[PDB]
């Protein structure tokens, strides 16, 4: 029963920012060990937690959360951001206790003329709450005259895309990231570590 | 919307190999969401797209034929697009239009500058994967009052899982810089009468004017913005018969 973190990794898909895709792991046997040692990834920040402690430990639910973004906005990607991804599109609240995992994905998600079916958030009314998801498309009112759904003057559509292109410099290619959050509720715990078996040794 | 401004400067004749900048100074919107392109046209001919500059500076497109030699780039601080032309050539002659781009939605040119005249004194390129913009007919003599249709035929479909067309079409007066007339197949623009309306979908498009008034009188484009290179048709003239 080992924890389906292959699913999450290496979907072939990605979700967009703006959309981000969230999978809750549940009853399962989690070894974060597998992914720390990796190599193929760039960014494997945690926060709260030692990721070594983490295979000593045990949570009532792990939530994967994973999109799409460029890679000087990874960083962003952290409590306490600014920016156009943490304010419009995902953020993490100060307390966070988890994992940010970011790996380079120009060789999956940039073409030639450019990739245009990533999208983020360019504007919004205020700023998302944590773990907070918002996929709507009302034309955005930059200014005092009303929009009533009709792109105009002050009044823009707010999913914008990042067109990602092979020739890019590094800081604008498309970077896959996977935050992993980590809950411990009242209710008994499910997602435990690799040394903890319900099977006989011998 | 009345009140956004595009002043190209920088034109002049100069010999072929040499170098120049182009600048467009913009006034009156939030320079800084919108995407920059440059738009030409030689002497006589239609429109060709030349680059993109996302707003932010993070990105750019050129088309095949000045990829290398011309750079875009843009000052936000200043509200300023630039074009550095370098390595002229003759064919490179044509007033220079800037545009801007909206944000979202991918390509549209929904304002458009006066142009600078640079003088060096339709083909889905060499993999084929361009699309083709092709009009119908070349002239349409009209009478006053008359309705007119003109349709568009593309190599390609601009219709997207989104649901939406990536059409526009654009008018030329007679000496007057292009304006934006529908833009996603089927709306209006802001000012455009409503006797003109634009309906099709996929690969066949058609604008419609169901009455005809002297100041209609122009050269119509399609253009598709689904994806870079930006293509238009080759032009259909309207005039009073």
């Known amino acids: 029963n080992l924890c389906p973190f292959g699913e999450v990794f290496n979907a072939t898909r990605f979700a967009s920012v703006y959309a981000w895709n969230r999978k809750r792991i549940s009853n399962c046997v989690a070894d974060y060990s597998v992914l720390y040692n990796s190599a193929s990834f760039s960014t494997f920040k945690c926060y709260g937690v030692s990721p070594t402690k983490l295979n000593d430990l045990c949570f009532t639910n792990v939530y994967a959360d994973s999109f799409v973004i460029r890679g000087d906005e990874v960083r962003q990607i952290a409590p306490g951001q600014t920016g156009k991804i943490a304010d419009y599109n995902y953020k993490l609240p100060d307390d966070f206790t988890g994992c940010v995992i970011a790996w380079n994905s120009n060789n999956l998600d940039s073409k030639v003329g450019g990739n245009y079916n990533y999208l983020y958030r360019l504007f919004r009314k205020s700023n998302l709450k944590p773990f907070e998801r918002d996929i709507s498309t009302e034309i955005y009112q930059a200014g005092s005259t009303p929009c009533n759904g009709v792109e105009g003057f002050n009044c823009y559509f707010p999913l914008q895309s990042y067109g990602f292109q092979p020739t890019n410099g590094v800081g604008y290619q498309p970077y896959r990231v996977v935050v992993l959050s980590f809950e411990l509720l009242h209710a008994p715990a499910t997602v435990c570590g690799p040394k903890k078996s319900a099977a006989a040794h011998h | 919307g009345s009140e956004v401004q595009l002043v190209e400067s920088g034109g002049g004749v100069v010999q072929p190999g040499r170098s120049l900048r182009l600048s467009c100074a913009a006034s009156?919107?939030?320079?800084?969401?919108?995407?920059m392109h440059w738009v030409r046209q030689a002497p006589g001919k239609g429109l060709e797209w030349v680059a993109v500059?996302?707003?932010?500076?993070?990105?750019?497109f050129y088309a095949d034929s000045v990829k290398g030699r011309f750079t875009i780039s843009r000052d936000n601080s200043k509200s300023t697009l630039y074009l550095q032309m370098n390595s002229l050539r003759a064919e490179d002659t044509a007033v220079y239009y800037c545009?801007?781009?909206?944000?979202?939605?991918?390509?549209?040119?929904?304002?458009w500058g006066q142009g600078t005249l640079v003088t060096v004194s339709g083909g889905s390129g060499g993999g084929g994967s361009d699309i083709v913009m092709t009009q119908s007919p070349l002239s349409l003599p009209v009478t006053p009052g008359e309705p007119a249709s003109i349709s568009c035929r593309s190599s390609?479909?601009?219709?997207?899982?989104?649901?939406?067309?990536?059409l526009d079409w654009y008018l030329q007066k007679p000496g007057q810089s292009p304006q934006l007339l529908i833009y996603?197949?089927?709306n209006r623009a802001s000012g455009v009468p409503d006797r003109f309306s634009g309906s099709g979908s996929g690969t066949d498009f058609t604008l419609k004017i169901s009455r005809v008034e002297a100041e209609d009188v122009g050269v119509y484009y399609c253009?598709?913005?689904?994806?870079?290179?930006?293509?238009f048709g080759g032009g259909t003239k309207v005039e009073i018969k």
């Open positions: 545009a801007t781009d909206p944000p979202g939605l991918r390509f549209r040119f929904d304002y």
């Open positions: 500059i996302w707003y932010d500076g993070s990105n750019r």
């Open positions: 996603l197949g089927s």
């Open positions: 253009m598709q913005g689904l994806q870079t290179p930006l293509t």
């Open positions: 390609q479909s601009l219709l997207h899982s989104n649901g939406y067309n990536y």
């Open positions: 009156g919107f939030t320079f800084s969401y919108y995407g």
